[PDB]
Amino acid sequence: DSLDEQRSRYAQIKQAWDNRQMDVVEQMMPGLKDYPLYPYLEYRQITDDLMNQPAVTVTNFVRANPTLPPARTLQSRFVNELARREDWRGLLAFSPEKPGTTEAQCNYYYAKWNTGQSEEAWQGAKELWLTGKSQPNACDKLFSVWRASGKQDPLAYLERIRLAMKAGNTGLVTVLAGQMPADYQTIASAIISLANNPNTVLTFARTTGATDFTRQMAAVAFASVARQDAENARLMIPSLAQAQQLNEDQIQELRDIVAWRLMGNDVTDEQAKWRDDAIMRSQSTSLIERRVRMALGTGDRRGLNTWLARLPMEAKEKDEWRYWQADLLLERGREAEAKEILHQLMQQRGFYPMVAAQRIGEEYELKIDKAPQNVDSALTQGPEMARVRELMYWNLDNTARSEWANLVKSKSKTEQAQLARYAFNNQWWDLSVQATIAGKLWDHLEERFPLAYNDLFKRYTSGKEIPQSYAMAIARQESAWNPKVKSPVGASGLMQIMPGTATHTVKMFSIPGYSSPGQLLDPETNINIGTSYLQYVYQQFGNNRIFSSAAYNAGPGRVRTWLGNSAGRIDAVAFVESIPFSETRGYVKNVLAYDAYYRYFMGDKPTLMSATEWGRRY
Numbered sequence: 001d002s003l004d005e006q007r008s009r010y011a012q013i014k015q016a017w018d019n020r021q022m023d024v025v026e027q028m029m030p031g032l033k034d035y036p037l038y039p040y041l042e043y044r045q046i047t048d049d050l051m052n053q054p055a056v057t058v059t060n061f062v063r064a065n066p067t068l069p070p071a072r073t074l075q076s077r078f079v080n081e082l083a084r085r086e087d088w089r090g091l092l093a094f095s096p097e098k099p100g101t102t103e104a105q106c107n108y109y110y111a112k113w114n115t116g117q118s119e120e121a122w123q124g125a126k127e128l129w130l131t132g133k134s135q136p137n138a139c140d141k142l143f144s145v146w147r148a149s150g151k152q153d154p155l156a157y158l159e160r161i162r163l164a165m166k167a168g169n170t171g172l173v174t175v176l177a178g179q180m181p182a183d184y185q186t187i188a189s190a191i192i193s194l195a196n197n198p199n200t201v202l203t204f205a206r207t208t209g210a211t212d213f214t215r216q217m218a219a220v221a222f223a224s225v226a227r228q229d230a231e232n233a234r235l236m237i238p239s240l241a242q243a244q245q246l247n248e249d250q251i252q253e254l255r256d257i258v259a260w261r262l263m264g265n266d267v268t269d270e271q272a273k274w275r276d277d278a279i280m281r282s283q284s285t286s287l288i289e290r291r292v293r294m295a296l297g298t299g300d301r302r303g304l305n306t307w308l309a310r311l312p313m314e315a316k317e318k319d320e321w322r323y324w325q326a327d328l329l330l331e332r333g334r335e336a337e338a339k340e341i342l343h344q345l346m347q348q349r350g351f352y353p354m355v356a357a358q359r360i361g362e363e364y365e366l367k368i369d370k371a372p373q374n375v376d377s378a379l380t381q382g383p384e385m386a387r388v389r390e391l392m393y394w395n396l397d398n399t400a401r402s403e404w405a406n407l408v409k410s411k412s413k414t415e416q417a418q419l420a421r422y423a424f425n426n427q428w429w430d431l432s433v434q435a436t437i438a439g440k441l442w443d444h445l446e447e448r449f450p451l452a453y454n455d456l457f458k459r460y461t462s463g464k465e466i467p468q469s470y471a472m473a474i475a476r477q478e479s480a481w482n483p484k485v486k487s488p489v490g491a492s493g494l495m496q497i498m499p500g501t502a503t504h505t506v507k508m509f510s511i512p513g514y515s516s517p518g519q520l521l522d523p524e525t526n527i528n529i530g531t532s533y534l535q536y537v538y539q540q541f542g543n544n545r546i547f548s549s550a551a552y553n554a555g556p557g558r559v560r561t562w563l564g565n566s567a568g569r570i571d572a573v574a575f576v577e578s579i580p581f582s583e584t585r586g587y588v589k590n591v592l593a594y595d596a597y598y599r600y601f602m603g604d605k606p607t608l609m610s611a612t613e614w615g616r617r618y
């Protein structure tokens, strides 16, 4: 036998298994014991009949496979199965210690109650209870018996209502208030009315006794009101402060909430004056930073000087604010002071350090730390690495990511760098990036930005205007090179393409052969459709990477709106910094920095922006 022959038998047993040709599977299983992925076959077998599995079988499998990701998750999964059987005694015999998942934890504590360990059951219940998040259905029975015991502190009950409200979990706020303990029954209806409609906040505030609880509840609803109508909330502050006898800090929080909603282009002069007075009296760093961005996005020089100065000392340490301090100093004719800041920025890694270099006409120096010459360690020769090798061979990147996560975890920086280089050497691009992240190897640029799917990117950009380096930068930011990754919202593959976008792109470009979003997990298909849409927004916005990256992330419409706001009054850097969506702003910064890294590894000059992008009016 050989690894090569086992690979064929492995693919064949999975094929038979998928067809439920169990006679073939039973005959083939024994002959695959020496294949690295045999534990995955055993796991599938055990879970196939989990409802009839004795605990001893599960315990034995979990103990025999300590580094197998699914063996680790089987612990919590079986705890849930024992709960389903109502085998409380068995659950604790199988899992004497608190399990890993929340659902399993709910069942673990209910098992404790069922076996006479009430005090311990209550300690766990309270810990699972104190969250604004909706917990697993399994916890319902636990919270119920906990409350029925008389040991549930009513203050803890009211506290979860506060947490739920803050989390925006109004459905939970309502359910809790609907089952309100007698202690707080008098305000139950008011709370339900507040969660149902935040516009009842003034009524809520006036009809309930002002306490820390009602003040916090009202403050959350107030922010919901400000989001729907900033003026309505602005005008309500006096009455709310009087209704709840709010102190200075509490009144300022209300001012901050409204100020956040008056950052639009449509604000009146009265609203703008009120907003700026509120921000002047604020202690909120993020609010002041948003105001600075408003000055940057409108070309307001005096405003930039004023608001940058209002930032607390700590915020002024940030790369962006240091650059904008230098920008102000340059215009003031303080060359030496400004250029020393820019030179200090150039010594660091990132977007601004590269902007600093281009600003003063100096070539940016990439700091590249090399991994060790020898990457072969005990970690690269053990059984877990052998499983990683097989998983990657079958293109099971998500499954391999979990194995790799265990392998790089709790390792020295040296070992994590060797693992990154080992992955890099084997062209396991996503694993290479994953190891650099785990080890925080930020200056190991070669392993952080591998030339992944190079031939495909070249082929699919040769007929387009978007640079190959640019398409790769976008992919790097989107998927960290894992072709099988999907976001919570459904974005898929290397370029994180949404199903709707793929369909719309295929139609717009008359691309053949696309019939299912599942194909987005194929590297070539993903790169084909992704480079197509990227080229679309690129040409639509005049071959400008700031606009195309922002459009790829937030959509063409948002970019048009932002450009209508700045209206040709600002420069490239101010446009990037003033982007109002933090996700898109960070996305653009990362992509521009990554494109420079890719140009470098391709042998081109890594200048941050083209002369056209750098000099254009925004």
Ligand SMILES: CC(=O)N[C@H]1[C@H](O[C@H]2[C@H](O[C@H](C)C(=O)N[C@@H](C)C(=O)N[C@H](C)C(=O)O)[C@@H](NC(C)=O)[C@@H]3OC[C@H]2O3)O[C@H](CO)[C@@H](O)[C@@H]1O
Residues within 6 Å of the ligand: 437, 448, 477, 478, 479, 480, 485, 486, 487, 488, 491, 496, 553, 583, 587, 590
């Ligand atoms: C698969 C997916 O969800 N993709 C979305 C992508 O999400 C990234 C995102 O990465 C950010 C930039 C990050 O800082 N990640 C950490 C792990 C990191 O240290 N990165 C290093 C700088 C590096 O070298 O890469 C994170 N997501 C969020 C929501 O914050 C998270 O980490 C990796 C992925 O999940 O973000 C894109 C938008 O920026 C999105 O379009 C894409 O669907």
